[PDB]
Symmetry: D2
């Protein structure tokens, strides 16, 4: 019924958006952590993809999923929408210092390493490019605006289909 | 300026219609390549704005004049406006009153809009779409270091398809007004 | 044609000198943008050559004429020549007598060659290099689907720096003659 | 004295070039296989990089190395040269069917997957782009010419510095 695939730059507030959306529609939030557990029955990746596909296509469940190539995997399911959440450098830096209790220099390095890792993971499995507007239905930069605004824009999008 | 909206777009996406709808909602002018072709056709310039410095490097004069029109209207006259294309999100980088949005669509939706707009068949529609998009990407990536169509180049990107032009316009207005 | 050599290059790399040295070694003409500006300035064309089909899509006439000059000289007149730039490796794709080579250099080497060539300082040299390279990349990637400067676009790429122009030229000749 | 860093598209003949060059100069051929062994004293990657660096910079050894970001790692060692070996699609296909005893369809899929994996590995650790001419001193497409010709062009390059 509603599947929301969330991509995000590290420290942009993408998890907070994902969660707020899941609370709004009262549906589950799936992540890497959950899928890691729930698929011990690159090999890992096939199991996770096939799981997201079960839930989407056959079980017809509603959920939010962060990452996991979900927008590529769920690509012909007419009930899923995707969004990529980004942020201002300074907004992200503060979010990552706070969450991880680290200094500025290290925050910035974590951001760069994590965004490289996401990009690599996504672009290996998908033909589309991580972070490019064509890969998603909506992209929102959090900075000029706050997480709640991003979340509401996404619900508007979804509620108006 | 008080509100400046810089719109980029894929050909056929409905991006002009969104730009128009926004200009009407806020009752401000809509500037385009067409208008700048007119009003921008008549040493101090190193405001360290990348497209201009780049334009100046020895080896279009038109491009500079248009950039400078846009920069003056935004920064010196403090006018509010909508500007489509023309590297405006890059030029007006340092202006904290500027928002930018990239409008895109799915193939079917765009091809339908283009055939209908241009009295053309599917084949042609899709060729036009690819040419104009390459054209805009080339113009943009020549003058800017950021990448045409990349989410990081903009504040908002909205794909028109699952949602219509009115829904995209409303979402841009919400972004703007909640800032 | 019997031998056709299509040369691409970074600005300042020594690529014109290699093209010249090759043309002299094989005693064939050296065609450039300059010459094509002259000799190529005066319906059948869908030889399914990508740059031409792309050029034809409705929305440069010059570009078509130059592509067609190159294509005719290669394929119909069977002439041997060196051609710098002008998308020649793409245009002459199907001609099994064509080799292509991309010439590049390290920064120091290029900046030195450019300052000396253009009576210019370091700062300017490096700005020129970046502008011309963006210019060539844009021209090339607009008309072709392959990527300017990517090794897959060419048969050979040689960085001039650790080795001189004579060494690069010899290596291209070895490639050609051992085929 | 001489360090040769070899990159390559899967099935292009890059290993055969690397080996022939090592025989020519009578120096060792290091690969992933060797480095895998010789560095149990992404964590793995640091150990391998630091090993290549020892051999290069401190021990001053001569060698050929395939892959392993060697051109990036050995970047200010004025005695190393890099080359990227590529191939014609049809030449590569036959080389991979023969070596791996597989059909055409599968050869082509192996090529695509292996080239994606190399690209990802390289582009994660390096700032330069796998396969781009600027990343290397020489790039050669084997197809119009054979492995021995590629190998000789590289020796010319090296011998003329
Ligand atoms: Cl992501
Ligand atoms: Cl645009
Ligand atoms: Cl070129
Ligand atoms: Cl490699």
């Amino acid at each position: 019924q509603i599947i929301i695939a969330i991509g995000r730059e590290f420290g942009s507030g993408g998890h907070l958006v994902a969660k707020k959306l899941a609370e709004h529609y009262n549906i589950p939030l799936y992540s890497k952590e959950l899928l890691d557990e729930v698929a011990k029955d690159q090999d890992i990746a096939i199991r996770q993809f096939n799981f997201i596909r079960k839930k989407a296509n056959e079980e017809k469940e509603s959920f939010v999923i962060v990452g996991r190539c979900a927008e590529e995997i769920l690509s012909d399911n007419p009930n899923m929408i995707s969004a990529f959440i980004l942020g201002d450098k300074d907004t992200k830096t503060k979010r990552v210092m706070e969450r991880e209790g680290v200094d500025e220099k290290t925050a910035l390095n974590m951001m760069k390493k994590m965004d490289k890792m996401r990009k690599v993971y996504h672009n290996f499995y998908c033909e589309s490019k991580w972070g490019d507007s064509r890969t998603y239905d909506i992209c929102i930069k959090i900075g000029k605006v706050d997480v709640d605004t991003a979340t509401d824009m996404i619900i508007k999008y979804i509620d108006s289909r």
